[PDB]
Amino acid sequence: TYPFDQNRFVQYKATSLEKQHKHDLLTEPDLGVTIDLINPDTYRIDPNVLLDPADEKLLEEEIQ
Amino acid sequence: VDVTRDIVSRERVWRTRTTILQSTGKNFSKNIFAILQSVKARE
Amino acid sequence: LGRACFCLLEGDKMDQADAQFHFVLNQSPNNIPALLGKACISFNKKDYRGALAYYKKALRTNPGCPAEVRLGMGHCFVKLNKLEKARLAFSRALELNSKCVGALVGLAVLELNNKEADSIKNGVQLLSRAYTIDPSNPMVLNHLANHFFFKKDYSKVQHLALHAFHNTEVEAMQAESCYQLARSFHVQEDYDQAFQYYYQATQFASSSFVLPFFGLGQMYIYRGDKENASQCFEKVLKAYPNNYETMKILGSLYAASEDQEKRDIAKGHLKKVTEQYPDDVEAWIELAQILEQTDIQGALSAYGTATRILQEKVQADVPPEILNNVGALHFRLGNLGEAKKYFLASLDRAKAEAEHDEHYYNAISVTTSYNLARLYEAMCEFHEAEKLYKNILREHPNYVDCYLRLGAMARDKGNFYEASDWFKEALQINQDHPDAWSLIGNLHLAKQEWGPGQKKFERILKQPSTQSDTYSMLALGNVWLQTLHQPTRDREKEKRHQDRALAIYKQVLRNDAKNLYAANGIGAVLAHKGYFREARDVFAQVREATADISDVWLNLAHIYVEQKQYISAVQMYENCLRKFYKHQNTEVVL
């Protein structure tokens, strides 16, 4: 048989298998927002409403 | 001695006695035991 | 709302919370976080479509929200690779409030894809700014931890990975915390603690990702715990196959012999890496290391490029264990001469292992010389075979196989030589040795007048430590069948002998269906029972099983001449004469 090194250690490393993983964001289980109908003391629905171009292109689901 | 365990560990046996007798194909014995019982049906 | 948000705290009554939020829309759908709390429930049920359906209704209205509805927008856009929308959502989150953490860490993970590209902005802008605005955020602590690992800062990773463990309470995050502390102490070789971290990392959240499983499996290489290494690494293949996860199961080869659950997967990994080359060096070694049971030519080819692969990285001579084994391959091939050259250069390379009594090149030379003497026997150079054998026995007399191959050599001369005495002293040095003990009665096969006496000399290692011994019990069947063809069958004596051999053959039948000498025995005894139409069938089976059994050639033609089928029989007789054994075998022409 061949006297193999016991490969108890990583030096390649597994970093190809590591940084390919995109890591979840689960800081707050309701997705990082306090869910409240009382803290909206303000509302943009009054004149005038605000809606940035970035905000319209996020109001679409998939239209590209 | 240390030579004994020293050699018998590092070598390998791929060819023993017993699997010479056993066939490299798959020849089961149900067919064999079926005709074994069939000759007993003549008995 | 109070009872619906009461439900998310405890992880249950979750559809109940969604229903009481939908009770809000049928009583008062007058503001959006009533229905956004539905969408976080939908998100946590992995229904990002049902999340974003209500999430479209957020930004059309946008109630008073410093908490950035766009943050969760981007996190849903993190899901299912809607990244460019995620970037824009986190960007506008930063424009409304740069102080908020979720946008910056979202883009930090978003650019965790490219590390060699845009390293610094990930390290400092995307991470250290999140550390600045919150030094207690276990995300950014975990990510600076794994960066410091890759930046080889192994100190402050253990400063902040503990806090990254304690400050979080969800399993996958503290699984990653334990995993990162485990990879920290693994490269720091504090493997006892890091093993526990790997196990906790697996036990916290398992379905997340498989690096903790890899950590435990390679940790089982420590401390000899490798049984669970295979089991844990199976989920790595259940995760997804890679080049990485071949070599772990290949080197961790519980596949020894006739164990396909580790051996077929070994074949699959070996032809997963053979076409590859992630600096393959030993990949051919553990290729051929299972190929010796299988096709020998595959082992030859593996050794062929394995001989080369030790020369280009450095011009390094091939270790003699390889060269001895390739000569051992050619021994069962026709390449006997270069097998001899392999053994010669093997012994030279072992001599070139001048100082390697750790590896015990001397012992390797001992077994190499054993192989070379066995080769000289194939040359029929029994003189030099004697020389090598007595050289080994004069230096390692504890060895037995050399002690009896010498005996076998004189057995070729005859039985009552020192053949029989080397055989008996092989039992004297090792009475536990079943091979030599079988060979004792094999000598006594010559003396067939010592037929009924062979019960005793084949009972000695019918101790059940040696049992089951198929070879010996078939020898019992054979010495029991040579009793037959006598005029005492009508006296029921050979009928009892036939049924006793039948009982032996049933026993070896049940313990092995795939033995062929057994089935030859059954067919022989029933042919002696006069069932020759019932014999050619059972011999036909072993005939396709292997033609290279000299007995079955005879026994089939006995049936043929029993139908007087001479023109089917004598040809197969001379086919049996096609072996290189004896120019006039007597009983065959009889």
PDB file of N, CA and C in Angstrom, chain C residues 342-383:
ATOM      1  N   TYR C 342      11.459  -4.914 -13.032  1.00  0.00           N
ATOM      2  CA  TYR C 342      10.800  -4.099 -12.021  1.00  0.00           C
ATOM      3  C   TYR C 342      11.226  -4.506 -10.630  1.00  0.00           C
ATOM      4  N   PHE C 343      11.330  -5.809 -10.378  1.00  0.00           N
ATOM      5  CA  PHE C 343      11.740  -6.237  -9.043  1.00  0.00           C
ATOM      6  C   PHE C 343      13.193  -5.888  -8.768  1.00  0.00           C
ATOM      7  N   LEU C 344      14.061  -6.034  -9.773  1.00  0.00           N
ATOM      8  CA  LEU C 344      15.451  -5.622  -9.618  1.00  0.00           C
ATOM      9  C   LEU C 344      15.561  -4.140  -9.283  1.00  0.00           C
ATOM     10  N   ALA C 345      14.931  -3.286 -10.086  1.00  0.00           N
ATOM     11  CA  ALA C 345      15.033  -1.857  -9.824  1.00  0.00           C
ATOM     12  C   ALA C 345      14.265  -1.462  -8.572  1.00  0.00           C
ATOM     13  N   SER C 346      13.273  -2.264  -8.170  1.00  0.00           N
ATOM     14  CA  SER C 346      12.619  -2.074  -6.885  1.00  0.00           C
ATOM     15  C   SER C 346      13.600  -2.280  -5.749  1.00  0.00           C
ATOM     16  N   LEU C 347      14.364  -3.367  -5.811  1.00  0.00           N
ATOM     17  CA  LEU C 347      15.339  -3.642  -4.769  1.00  0.00           C
ATOM     18  C   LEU C 347      16.431  -2.583  -4.757  1.00  0.00           C
ATOM     19  N   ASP C 348      16.804  -2.088  -5.940  1.00  0.00           N
ATOM     20  CA  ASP C 348      17.761  -0.986  -5.999  1.00  0.00           C
ATOM     21  C   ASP C 348      17.204   0.291  -5.381  1.00  0.00           C
ATOM     22  N   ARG C 349      15.942   0.613  -5.649  1.00  0.00           N
ATOM     23  CA  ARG C 349      15.365   1.827  -5.093  1.00  0.00           C
ATOM     24  C   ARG C 349      15.176   1.701  -3.588  1.00  0.00           C
ATOM     25  N   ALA C 350      14.875   0.492  -3.115  1.00  0.00           N
ATOM     26  CA  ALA C 350      14.876   0.245  -1.683  1.00  0.00           C
ATOM     27  C   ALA C 350      16.269   0.416  -1.104  1.00  0.00           C
ATOM     28  N   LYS C 351      17.289  -0.042  -1.823  1.00  0.00           N
ATOM     29  CA  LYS C 351      18.659   0.282  -1.454  1.00  0.00           C
ATOM     30  C   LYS C 351      18.899   1.784  -1.523  1.00  0.00           C
ATOM     31  N   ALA C 352      18.270   2.464  -2.483  1.00  0.00           N
ATOM     32  CA  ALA C 352      18.317   3.918  -2.507  1.00  0.00           C
ATOM     33  C   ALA C 352      17.498   4.545  -1.382  1.00  0.00           C
ATOM     34  N   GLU C 353      16.614   3.785  -0.733  1.00  0.00           N
ATOM     35  CA  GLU C 353      16.029   4.203   0.544  1.00  0.00           C
ATOM     36  C   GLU C 353      16.984   3.813   1.668  1.00  0.00           C
ATOM     37  N   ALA C 354      18.155   4.452   1.661  1.00  0.00           N
ATOM     38  CA  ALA C 354      19.253   4.048   2.529  1.00  0.00           C
ATOM     39  C   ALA C 354      18.944   4.175   4.014  1.00  0.00           C
ATOM     40  N   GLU C 355      18.112   5.133   4.398  1.00  0.00           N
ATOM     41  CA  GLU C 355      17.915   5.499   5.794  1.00  0.00           C
ATOM     42  C   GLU C 355      16.471   5.399   6.262  1.00  0.00           C
ATOM     43  N   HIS C 356      15.663   4.540   5.645  1.00  0.00           N
ATOM     44  CA  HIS C 356      14.209   4.615   5.786  1.00  0.00           C
ATOM     45  C   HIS C 356      13.642   3.401   6.520  1.00  0.00           C
ATOM     46  N   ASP C 357      14.283   3.050   7.638  1.00  0.00           N
ATOM     47  CA  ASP C 357      13.739   2.006   8.498  1.00  0.00           C
ATOM     48  C   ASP C 357      12.452   2.419   9.196  1.00  0.00           C
ATOM     49  N   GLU C 358      12.073   3.696   9.136  1.00  0.00           N
ATOM     50  CA  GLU C 358      10.705   4.061   9.471  1.00  0.00           C
ATOM     51  C   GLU C 358       9.727   3.452   8.477  1.00  0.00           C
ATOM     52  N   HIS C 359       9.959   3.681   7.188  1.00  0.00           N
ATOM     53  CA  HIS C 359       9.191   3.078   6.108  1.00  0.00           C
ATOM     54  C   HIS C 359       9.544   1.612   5.906  1.00  0.00           C
ATOM     55  N   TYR C 360      10.665   1.176   6.480  1.00  0.00           N
ATOM     56  CA  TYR C 360      11.126  -0.209   6.495  1.00  0.00           C
ATOM     57  C   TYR C 360      11.272  -0.752   5.072  1.00  0.00           C
ATOM     58  N   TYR C 361      12.131  -0.053   4.329  1.00  0.00           N
ATOM     59  CA  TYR C 361      12.561  -0.511   3.017  1.00  0.00           C
ATOM     60  C   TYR C 361      13.161  -1.905   3.075  1.00  0.00           C
ATOM     61  N   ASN C 362      13.766  -2.275   4.203  1.00  0.00           N
ATOM     62  CA  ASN C 362      14.256  -3.635   4.383  1.00  0.00           C
ATOM     63  C   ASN C 362      13.120  -4.655   4.324  1.00  0.00           C
ATOM     64  N   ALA C 363      12.013  -4.381   5.018  1.00  0.00           N
ATOM     65  CA  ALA C 363      10.851  -5.260   4.959  1.00  0.00           C
ATOM     66  C   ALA C 363      10.223  -5.265   3.576  1.00  0.00           C
ATOM     67  N   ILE C 364      10.222  -4.103   2.930  1.00  0.00           N
ATOM     68  CA  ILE C 364       9.746  -4.013   1.559  1.00  0.00           C
ATOM     69  C   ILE C 364      10.631  -4.834   0.632  1.00  0.00           C
ATOM     70  N   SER C 365      11.941  -4.806   0.860  1.00  0.00           N
ATOM     71  CA  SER C 365      12.854  -5.659   0.115  1.00  0.00           C
ATOM     72  C   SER C 365      12.600  -7.123   0.407  1.00  0.00           C
ATOM     73  N   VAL C 366      12.187  -7.439   1.632  1.00  0.00           N
ATOM     74  CA  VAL C 366      11.876  -8.819   1.987  1.00  0.00           C
ATOM     75  C   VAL C 366      10.710  -9.326   1.151  1.00  0.00           C
ATOM     76  N   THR C 367       9.623  -8.563   1.109  1.00  0.00           N
ATOM     77  CA  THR C 367       8.485  -9.028   0.326  1.00  0.00           C
ATOM     78  C   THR C 367       8.751  -8.900  -1.172  1.00  0.00           C
ATOM     79  N   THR C 368       9.610  -7.961  -1.565  1.00  0.00           N
ATOM     80  CA  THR C 368       9.999  -7.833  -2.963  1.00  0.00           C
ATOM     81  C   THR C 368      10.789  -9.042  -3.419  1.00  0.00           C
ATOM     82  N   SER C 369      11.740  -9.464  -2.601  1.00  0.00           N
ATOM     83  CA  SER C 369      12.483 -10.687  -2.843  1.00  0.00           C
ATOM     84  C   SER C 369      11.578 -11.899  -2.838  1.00  0.00           C
ATOM     85  N   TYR C 370      10.548 -11.901  -1.995  1.00  0.00           N
ATOM     86  CA  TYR C 370       9.572 -12.983  -2.039  1.00  0.00           C
ATOM     87  C   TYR C 370       8.889 -13.034  -3.398  1.00  0.00           C
ATOM     88  N   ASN C 371       8.473 -11.870  -3.893  1.00  0.00           N
ATOM     89  CA  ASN C 371       7.854 -11.797  -5.208  1.00  0.00           C
ATOM     90  C   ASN C 371       8.825 -12.216  -6.298  1.00  0.00           C
ATOM     91  N   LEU C 372      10.090 -11.829  -6.171  1.00  0.00           N
ATOM     92  CA  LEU C 372      11.078 -12.161  -7.190  1.00  0.00           C
ATOM     93  C   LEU C 372      11.410 -13.645  -7.178  1.00  0.00           C
ATOM     94  N   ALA C 373      11.426 -14.263  -6.001  1.00  0.00           N
ATOM     95  CA  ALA C 373      11.605 -15.704  -5.935  1.00  0.00           C
ATOM     96  C   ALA C 373      10.410 -16.429  -6.523  1.00  0.00           C
ATOM     97  N   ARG C 374       9.207 -15.914  -6.276  1.00  0.00           N
ATOM     98  CA  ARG C 374       8.022 -16.464  -6.912  1.00  0.00           C
ATOM     99  C   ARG C 374       8.105 -16.309  -8.424  1.00  0.00           C
ATOM    100  N   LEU C 375       8.722 -15.216  -8.877  1.00  0.00           N
ATOM    101  CA  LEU C 375       8.981 -15.019 -10.294  1.00  0.00           C
ATOM    102  C   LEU C 375      10.005 -16.005 -10.828  1.00  0.00           C
ATOM    103  N   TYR C 376      11.075 -16.253 -10.077  1.00  0.00           N
ATOM    104  CA  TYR C 376      12.072 -17.224 -10.508  1.00  0.00           C
ATOM    105  C   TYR C 376      11.462 -18.610 -10.617  1.00  0.00           C
ATOM    106  N   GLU C 377      10.475 -18.882  -9.774  1.00  0.00           N
ATOM    107  CA  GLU C 377       9.688 -20.095  -9.927  1.00  0.00           C
ATOM    108  C   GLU C 377       8.920 -20.089 -11.244  1.00  0.00           C
ATOM    109  N   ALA C 378       8.431 -18.926 -11.679  1.00  0.00           N
ATOM    110  CA  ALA C 378       7.784 -18.824 -12.981  1.00  0.00           C
ATOM    111  C   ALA C 378       8.766 -18.952 -14.139  1.00  0.00           C
ATOM    112  N   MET C 379      10.005 -18.474 -13.980  1.00  0.00           N
ATOM    113  CA  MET C 379      11.116 -18.803 -14.864  1.00  0.00           C
ATOM    114  C   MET C 379      11.532 -20.255 -14.744  1.00  0.00           C
ATOM    115  N   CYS C 380      11.012 -20.956 -13.735  1.00  0.00           N
ATOM    116  CA  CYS C 380      11.497 -22.263 -13.317  1.00  0.00           C
ATOM    117  C   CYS C 380      12.974 -22.205 -12.966  1.00  0.00           C
ATOM    118  N   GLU C 381      13.408 -21.045 -12.461  1.00  0.00           N
ATOM    119  CA  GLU C 381      14.761 -20.852 -11.958  1.00  0.00           C
ATOM    120  C   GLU C 381      14.642 -21.145 -10.465  1.00  0.00           C
ATOM    121  N   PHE C 382      14.426 -22.417 -10.166  1.00  0.00           N
ATOM    122  CA  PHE C 382      14.266 -22.846  -8.794  1.00  0.00           C
ATOM    123  C   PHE C 382      15.553 -22.748  -8.009  1.00  0.00           C
ATOM    124  N   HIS C 383      16.698 -22.746  -8.686  1.00  0.00           N
ATOM    125  CA  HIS C 383      17.970 -22.536  -8.006  1.00  0.00           C
ATOM    126  C   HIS C 383      18.024 -21.161  -7.356  1.00  0.00           C
TER     127      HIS C 383
END
